Structures are given as C-alpha cells and as structure tokens.
C-alpha cells in the first residue's frame, strides 16, 4: 500500500484498501473510512466494480438525464467519488470551508456554499436527485466567480470547476462532444 493519503498527500494514521494499494485518512475518503469491514474497499474500488458489474454503463449518457436521476445507492456512491475527486485537488482548501464576504466592491453570495457543507449533505442523504448535489457543486464557483468580479482570484474558481465538470462527465459517462 502508498505510504501517503490519496485525497490530501500527507502521511499520517492510514486506512489502506484490501484491493487495490491506495490508503486514505479516515475523513479523507468518502464515505468516512468504515469502523469494521475486514476486507476493506476503497471507494475508487467500489466504482470499479459497478463499471465492471454493468460494462453498457459507459456507454454515453445525456446530462439531462443524468441530473434526474434519483439517489440510489449506486449514485449516492457516484456523488461521494466525484466529492473525492475534487477534494483530491490541493485549489480544493479554498472552497471546503464556510466562506465570509467583505471586499470592497463586491457583495455576497445570497446562497453560499462550500465542499464541506456538500459533503455534510451527502452523509445526511438530503439529496433526493443527482441534480441537488450537483447544482450545489456548481453553486460554490459560480458564487466565487460572481463575488471576485476582476480579481486574478477568480481563476481559482474556474481551475477547481474544471476539475469538478472532468470528473462528472467521465464518473457518469457523459456523451462526449465537440
Ligand atoms: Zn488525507
Ligand atoms: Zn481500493
Ligand atoms: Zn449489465
């Protein structure tokens, strides 16, 4: 097994997989690493297996359905890797927390938004569909965006979302197009 967490590349007290040689800080994976189970998957194993389970899986979908889609376990699972995904980025640190507003300028968001507030969210199952958590994740930059106007700053929204839109279109096998 890697001797550092996967999500943040630190050391420290470590999880490792039964079936494949990543390891995770315990609030690092998503869901938080499991109390018992002996073996242990990781969630980039348990999206393997569903990949695997049902190939016609990554065959192309439209986004519109996709976002209606209600959150079953395997789509609950879907939203917690792309979750992961974004917080495997280190620009993540600027969106996990619950941001404050005063900038000279500019006035704050009327819906705000953070990683960690999705991640809450998703551990309370308050998502009926794939459209709530992704609208959420869309919500955190477009917010940043709005509030930073000119500010080189801004770019930080857009490197993060781009990271975010990637995953989302190759976790849920989004029809690629020109
Ligand atoms: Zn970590
Ligand atoms: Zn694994
Ligand atoms: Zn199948």
């Known amino acids: ?104 300028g500019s006035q704050g968001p009327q819906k705000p938004m953070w990683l960690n507030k999705v991640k809450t969210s998703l551990n309370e199952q308050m998502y009926t569909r794939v459209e709530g958590f992704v609208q959420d994740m869309r919500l955190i930059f477009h917010n940043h965006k709005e509030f930073y106007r000119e500010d080189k700053f801004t770019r930080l929204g857009i490197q993060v979302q781009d990271i975010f839109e990637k995953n989302f279109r190759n976790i849920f096998a989004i029809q690629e197009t020109s």
């Open 1 to 104: 097994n890697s001797n550092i967490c996967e999500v943040c590349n630190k050391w420290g007290r470590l999880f490792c997989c039964d079936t494949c040689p990543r390891s995770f800080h315990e609030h690092c994976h998503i869901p938080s690493v499991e109390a018992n189970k002996n073996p242990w998957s990781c969630i980039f194993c348990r999206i393997k297996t569903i990949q695997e389970r049902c190939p016609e899986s990554q065959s192309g979908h439209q986004e519109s359905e996709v976002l209606m889609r209600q959150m079953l376990p395997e789509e609950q699972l879907k939203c917690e890797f792309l979750l992961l995904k974004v917080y495997c980025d280190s620009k993540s640190c600027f969106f996990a927390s619950e941001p404050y507003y005063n900038r000279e």
